[PDB]
Write a structure and sequence with these properties.
Two copies of one chain form a homodimer.
Chain A: E1 4-10, E2 14-20, E3 26-33, E4 36-40, H1 48-56, E5 64-68, H2 80-86, E6 90-94, H3 95-98, E7 110-113, E8 119-121, E9 127-132, E10 142-146, E11 151-155, H4 174-188, H5 192-204, E12 209-212, E13 218-219, H6 221-231
Parallel strand pairs in A: 4-5, 5-6, 6-7, 11-12
Antiparallel strand pairs in A: 1-2, 2-3, 3-4, 8-9, 9-10, 10-11, 12-13
PDB class: signaling protein
Keywords: chemotaxis sensor, phosphatase
Assembly: dimeric
Chain lengths: ~240, ~240
């Protein structure tokens, strides 16, 4: 079982945990508050049994009450079923996808996130806020801001998809990090109009960390380095000449 | 199920609708098959049955997927197991499929042609950000039928053909206003599609546009304010 658990934040009531492997890939983000669990974008089947272990070192899968999905994901199918089977958790996902997910046949297990977001209360009394992230790239898309840790789980935003070669937990050189994320964002984010509005919204939150689903985490100056780069990014339909 | 409606036929070439609502579009050219958005894991056994009324799955050479779907994946394995067909999908989603890559044809962003035994061609029509970032329609040149995928679809979030456009509008307006990215992309798509000059626009779900309803749909869509045009509702 080659999976490591790295606690990014901890305070006796609350933990924000990164779970991943090496040959360093992110596999699962997990929040534990009191003794209850929140899973962020659980996804992979090829990871399920090994992710269940790393989780079980911090919490029984019994006690995972909430699953957060940043968007609808071609993943599974084979993926939600297992998490819905071993957890009794509620699933939070954009209202845009609730009707289509039985194709999750049990609609009762899903909580629709309205377009402008909502708060989700934790046993400690801290809140997680669903951060509107629409059209970056999915039309119905959210991040999850853990207020207590001030960590923004951004999903695909800021993610180094296609690659999984970082060595470190955190981004250490933004310009050296840029080749890993630029191509994805230029092609998948809908337009500079939406990403610059997103950055302005995210800037009003002042997360100490931006944690994407894949690739190293932005912390300290790299938070502003990423937001400054994204705010000016020409992307997507801005290159409409390349799409027809 | 299951009823089949032949939308076009000419002894060399057939465009067939299969349904229960729509379940499957099928093209037969000579004796060879093309599948449009076969999809379902929960529908696989049901679709192979409907297909088998017109063609042996042996003879399916081409499968077309408009975009990525949690039902598209997990499904592809099944279709590669019962057919020897090539599967066409956007290059954006081929890259993630290490999740036999040899059977896959990545469609580049500006589209590509698919040759048929009769010598007719099918065109992959760029449809990006309506709503998926990597998305195509399929234009059957011989029939002049455009398979549009989600575009024009009554996804619900009931005749074969649209017969009253204004009565059909509530079934499609909410989906298009919220899911299509912007009028910029949507009007450019219509301008592209008008040059194909389709006789039919057949979506994945909902009634099919034919005769005057093709221009009615395209005219309505080209002026449709959608997506980030309502940025005030998104934050």
């Amino acid at each position: 079982n080659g999976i490591d658990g790295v606690v990014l934040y901890e305070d006796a009531d609350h933990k924000f945990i990164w779970l991943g492997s090496e040959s360093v890939q992110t596999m699962q983000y997990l929040i534990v508050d009191r003794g209850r669990g929140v899973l962020l974008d659980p996804g992979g089947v090829h990871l399920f049994s090994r992710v269940v272990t790393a989780i079980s070192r911090f919490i029984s899968v019994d006690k995972i009450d909430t699953i957060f999905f940043s968007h609808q994901d071609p993943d599974v199918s084979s993926g939600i079923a297992l998490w819905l089977g071993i957890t009794k958790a509620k699933i939070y996902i954009s209202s845009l996808w609730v009707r289509f997910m039985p194709h999750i046949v049990d609609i009762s297990r899903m909580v629709p996130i309205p377009d402008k977001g909502m708060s989700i209360s934790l046993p400690s009394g801290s809140n997680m806020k669903c951060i509107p992230s629409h059209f970056m790239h999915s039309p119905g898309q959210f991040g999850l801001y853990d207020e207590r840790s001030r960590i923004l789980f951004s999903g695909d935003i800021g993610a180094a998809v296609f690659d999984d070669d970082n060595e470190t937990t955190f981004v250490e050189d933004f310009e050296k990090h840029l080749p890993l994320i630029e191509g994805f964002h230029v092609r998948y984010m809908a337009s500079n109009k939406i990403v610059s509005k997103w950055v302005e919204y995210v800037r009003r939150l002042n997360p100490l960390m931006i944690a994407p689903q894949h690739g190293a985490i932005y912390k300290d100056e790299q938070v502003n380095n990423f937001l400054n780069w994204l705010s000016g990014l020409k992307c997507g339909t801005d290159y409409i000449e390349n799409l027809f």
